[PDB]
Structure 1
């Protein structure tokens, strides 16, 4: 990121402190939890709404010392009133703007927001699990402000969880108790806390909705698949991701050794010596070196990050993913709750930046062999079946003789999002009956209101609706501003928070109190449907055949001779 963008950002951080102070009131309030009393504070929004904010509620013990890399443990209660008027730190990560490591190992907190602590009936509870590819992200209100959702009579809860190697180290050695998925277990513990405390803030414990974008969508899906959480909630929304995306799963058991060697470990490769070195390293060193972990072959095969959700190599009381995610889908409790999924209209525009720095990536479309699903491709990607499968992808996305940047981004929308969504819908349809799933397509472009991911993807000036572009209409962030009530941006905020709030309430996202949705009727997807229908959300709200469908079928035709793997 440029020095100019670094200065703008710093300035915005400073402005934000002042905006935050102005928006804070002297009305404090105390609420009860299973663990003790917490003190929150009422705050305003730039729309002159107001809400009670409780931040820094621990849902687990600080995962430090011998707790590093282990399943989270329940937090220790207190008497007195814990101060929750301030935010806690974020999980240790590289700051996307400054490129310096920030955060702290002491990051297992959640934040609770609502326009009314004593409503007359228990309200729908919405739980946001943030994205950031399992390596960045936070619940700070400078990027995930509840300002818009608190117009609605809901309780909104934003969680943190362990990221990177500290959340996702995995070791085969059973004696060590580092099976993997610590960060997802953080998520489970947070959802247990919410279940058992949401009533104290006016929330209905029998009507919880979990939602997330990108890796938060994968996370939400995982919360719908694991037995650890059976029955804990009642709706799920998967925004631009799910647990069977190729980026959402990795076998990272050999990678802890590599990480340790990068950090200076001297010795042989066994799990115990490797863990002991890692248990004593400074956390920022681990996180800083993590970008060097993956090999050239791994990157070429599109393994996105060294550490993430994995198949745990042995069972424990706290195991979250005992099998591959596909196999988990077959028996998932969450298959039986109302579900909404969707994507943006030009997801792969996100990768503009990566294309800038590596223009030769476009030549991967000459044969598209690097985009064939790794379960079907040979190791060197030189087999004749692999060239054939690559030709399906090429014919779907390469529009002229020579591939372009756009063809590459369009193919990416599919590889990363539309194709795994299709695999999931069909897989799910065969291992459930009845419970509806609804689709949306987010297709509203503006550069008047943005979020910080735009600075990360170097998308200033770039037309089309990228991965992350919808977040802007759900959450306040420090680059936002008060928009006129008549603005198309403002209307999109109301439509988005409105639809999400409707679905959370009844499990059906249709309502005719939402403007633009009067000549609409929003049917769920049926197992027999050959073409998917979605609510396309742009300046107009309109049901349409998913425009991506034709390409989706073409990707599917790569499994012609291996139907059992699709």
Structure 2
């Protein structure tokens, strides 16, 4: 990330600290939790609203020392008042602006926000799980401010969970009790705390909506799949992702050794000796070295991250993923709660930044073999069958004689997001009670209001609606400003936060109290449907046939002779 954006960020960081101070009040409040009393503070927003803020609430034991890499444990109770007027630190991770490691191993906290601590009826409880490829992210308000949401009468909760190797290291040896998915198990324990405590903040524990974006969407889906959380919440919103996306799980049991070796480990490849090195190593050193773990073979086959959600190699008491995600959909309790899913209109436009450092990647579309789903392609991607599947991908996205950068980002829309959505819907239909799933497509493009991911994807002065562009209309961030109430940006904030709160309350996302939804008839998808219908959210709200459908079906055709793998 460029020096200019570095300094620009530094200045906004300084600005945001002073704004946070100014927007704080002297009105402190004490709430009960099952672990003891917590002191919150009231804060202001730039739209002159106010909300009660409880930050730094622990839902787990700090996972340091002997707890590193292991499943979370319930926290120790206290008798007194815990100060929850300030944010805790984020999971150890690489800062995408600076490039330096930041955060702490003491990161297992959640935040609770609400405009009214003593409501006259118990309110819908919304739980946000942040994305960031399972390697970055936070529940800090300089990125995920509840300011827009607290206009509505809900209780909003933003959690943290362990990222990267510290969250998702996985070892085969059953004796060492590091099966993997510690970060997902963090998420589970946070949910159990929310189930059992949200009533003290005016939340209705029988009406809980979990939602997330990207890795947060995959997480939300994982929380809908595991037996660990059965009945814990009642609605889910999968924003631009799910658990059968190709980036959303990996078999990383060998990569522990690689990481130890990178960090100075001397000795042999056996799990015990590897684990002991990794347990004494500096958290920052391990996280700094994660970038280098993936081999060139793996990157070529589009493995995105070294460590992440995995099929655990043996079953433990706190086990979250005992089989591959596709196998888990077939027995998922989550299939039978109301669900909303959706994508932006140009998801892959995200990859522009990566495309600029690696022009050669566009030549991959010449045969498209590297984008054939892994389970179908052969090792070297050279089998005649593989070239044939590659060809169906190429016919679907390459528009001219020679492939373009837009052809590439278009393919990425489908490789990373739309095709996995299509596979999940169909698979889910075969194993569900028949609760509704609603589709949206977020199609609203603005450069007047932005979020920090635009800095990462080099999205300055770029048209079209990329992955993460929609977060801007759900959460306050330190790059935001106050928008006039007549502005198309403000209206979208209203529509977006309104639909989500509407879905959270009733399990049905439609309301005629939302501006623009007058002639909207938003039906759930049926298994009988050959064509998906979605609400397309632009300046106007319009029900349309999913535009990506024809390409979606092309991808499906690659499974013609392998319908069992679909």
- The TM tier, using the shorter chain, reads over 0.9
Kindly indicate whether residue 465 of structure 2 is the aligned counterpart of residue 476 of structure 1. Answer: no
Describe the SS at the equivalent of 2:144: coil
Counterpart of 2:28 in 1: which secondary structure?
Answer: strand
Aligned equivalent of 1:442: 442
Deviation digits for residues 110-157 of structure 1, max 9, x if unmatched?
000000011011000000000000000000000000000000000000
- 3-state SS of paired residue (2:32): strand
Write the deviation string for residues 270-313 of structure 1: whole angstroms up to 9, x where unpaired: 00000000000000000000000000000000000000000000
Q: Tell me the distance in 1 between the aligned counterparts of 2:104 and 2:171.
A: 23
Kindly state the Cα deviation for residue 363 of structure 1 after the two structures are TM-superposed: 0.1
Secondary structure of the corresponding residue to residue 302 of structure 1: coil
Determine the structure 2 residue equivalent to 1:536.
Answer: 536
Q: How many residues align?
A: 566
Q: CA deviation at 1:82?
A: 0.2
TM-score, L = length of structure 1: 1.00
**SS of equivalent residue, structure 1 residue 143:** helix
CA deviation vs aligned residue, 1:535-566 (integer Å, no higher than 9, x gap): 00000001000000000000000000000001
2:81 and 2:531 mapped to 1: Cα distance? 55
Instruction: Give the deviation of 1:63 after TM superposition.
Output: 0.1
Measured in 2, the distance between the counterparts of 1:446 and 1:395 equals 32
Shift of 1:178: 0.2
Deviation at 1:19, TM superposition (A): 0.6
SS in 1 for 2:40: strand
Which residue in the other structure is 1:103 paired with? 103
Equivalent positions of 1:468-547 (< 5 A) are: 468-547=468-547
How many angstroms apart in 1 are the aligned matches of 2:220 and 2:543? 25
Give the secondary structure class of the aligned counterpart of 1:501: helix
Mapped to 2, the partners of 1:492 and 1:390 lie a distance apart of 39
- Aligned equivalents of 1:434, 1:383: Cα separation in 2: 41
Residue by residue over 1:236-273, the C-alpha shift from the partner in whole angstroms, topping out at 9 and shown as x without a partner, is: 00000000000001000000000000000000000000
Describe the SS at the equivalent of 2:141.
coil
Q: What are the within-5 Å matches in structure 2 for residues 328-477 of structure 1?
A: 328-477=328-477
Q: Distance in 2 between matches of 1:241 and 1:550?
A: 20
Per-residue CA deviation, residues 42-69 of structure 1 (Å, 9 max, x unaligned), is 0010000100000000000000000000
Separation in structure 1 between the aligned mates of residue 16 and residue 232 of structure 2, nearest angstrom: 36
Instruction: Provide the secondary structure at the position in 2 that maps to 1:174.
Output: coil
CA distance in 1, matches of 2:355, 2:315: 41
How much does 1:433 deviate? Answer: 2.7
Could you tell me which residue of structure 1 aligns to residue 161 of structure 2? 161
Deviations 1:10-69 (A, max 9, x none): 000000011111100110000000000000000010000100000000000000000000
| Per-residue deviation, residues 289-348 of structure 1 (Å, max 9, x unmatched) | 000000000000000000000000000100000000000000000000000000000000
Structure-2 separation of matches of 1:369 and 1:350? 22
Q: Tell me how far apart the structure 1 counterparts of residues 434 and 250 of structure 2 sit (CA, whole Å).
A: 32
Other structure's SS at 2:258 match: helix
CA distance in 2, matches of 1:29, 1:294: 48
Structure 1 residue ranges without an equivalent (≥5) = none
Partner of 2:11: 11
Deviation at 1:434, TM superposition (A): 1.2
Let me know the Cα RMSD of the aligned residues: 0.3
SS state of the match for residue 125, structure 1? strand
Displacement, 1:391? Answer: 0.5
Alpha-carbon distance, 1:412 to partner = 0.2
Distance 1:60 1:124 in 2: 24
Write the deviation string for residues 396-417 of structure 1: whole angstroms up to 9, x where unpaired. Answer: 0000000000000000000000
Structure 2: tracts of 5 or more residues without a match: none
TM-score, normalization by structure 2: 1.00
Q: Distance in 1 between matches of 2:350 and 2:507?
A: 31
Describe the superposition over 1:395-452 as per-residue Cα deviations: whole angstroms up to 9, x where unpaired. 0000000000000000000000000000000000001131100000000000000000
Cα distance, 1:72 vs. partner? 0.1
Q: Residue 51 of structure 1 aligns to a residue in which SS?
A: strand
Matches of 2:383 and 2:517, distance apart in 1:
50
Q: Counterpart in 2 of 1:320?
A: 320
**Counterpart-to-counterpart distance in 2, 1:195 and 1:117:** 17
Q: Deviations over 1:208-233 (max 9, x none)?
A: 00000000000000000000000000
Q: Which digits, 9 at most, give the CA deviation of each residue in 1:182-233, with x for residues without a partner?
A: 0000000000000000000000000000000000000000000000000000
